[PDB]
Amino acid sequence: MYIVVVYDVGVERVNKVKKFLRMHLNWVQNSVFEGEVTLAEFERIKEGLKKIIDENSDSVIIYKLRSMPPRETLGIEKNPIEEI
Amino acid sequence: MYIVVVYDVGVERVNKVKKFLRMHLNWVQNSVFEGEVTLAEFERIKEGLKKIIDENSDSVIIYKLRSMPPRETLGIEKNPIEEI
């Protein structure tokens, strides 16, 4: 399993979720992280993110892919594909 | 082809790219659009987005998938899966 996590979280609560995912997935651009995970770690990411975030206000989308998808990037590549 | 477009564009230039993608793809959450496209329309989205945005500063990631990926959403679903 491979997932791309994109999120819209109000400031002064974003930095919090950012720190969290930085220890689970790779940071692609602002508000975007992706990486491989185990059916267990996947539950853990969403587990913590479930309380590290405030529903009703924030939004988090977690696409569930089978492998690292190809991508086309414009502008300053927030992170070299190789570096991950 | 199906793509998920995520972007980080400075304000007062974001609204511009937002209007553009709203006429090409579906809006999932803030800074995220996805939808099906033809090898032609795909070139068109990135074509316009290529000049509707300022490199060196902005960042745009366009994942290239074969079909609408499954997703897990937390918080206020910025848009019902069915509504698209």
Swiss-Prot record, chains A, B:
**Keywords from the UniProt entry:** Antiviral defense, Endonuclease, Hydrolase, Magnesium, Metal-binding, Nuclease
Q: Kind of enzyme, top EC level?
A: hydrolase
Q: Which CDD domains match?
A: Cas2_I_II_III
Q: What is its EC number?
A: 3.1.-.-
Stored InterPro entries? CRISPR_associated_Cas2 (IPR021127), Virulence_VapD/CRISPR_Cas2 (IPR019199)
Instruction: Give the residue spans that cross the bilayer.
Output: none
Organism superkingdom: Archaea
Say if the entry is tagged with keyword Hydrolase: yes
Q: Which SUPFAM superfamilies match?
A: TTP0101/SSO1404-like (SSF143430)
So where does Mg(2+) get bound?
Answer: D8
What Pfam families does its record include?
CRISPR_Cas2
Family the UniProt entry places it in: Belongs to the CRISPR-associated endoribonuclease Cas2 protein family.
Q: How does it assemble?
A: Homodimer, forms a heterotetramer with a Cas1 homodimer.
Q: What does this protein do?
A: CRISPR (clustered regularly interspaced short palindromic repeat), is an adaptive immune system that provides protection against mobile genetic elements (viruses, transposable elements and conjugative plasmids). CRISPR clusters contain sequences complementary to antecedent mobile elements and target invading nucleic acids. CRISPR clusters are transcribed and processed into CRISPR RNA (crRNA). Functions as a ssRNA-specific endoribonuclease. Involved in the integration of spacer DNA into the CRISPR cassette.
Q: Spell out the protein name for this chain.
A: CRISPR-associated endoribonuclease Cas2
Q: Say which species the protein is native to.
A: Pyrococcus furiosus (strain ATCC 43587 / DSM 3638 / JCM 8422 / Vc1)
Protein encoded by which gene: cas2
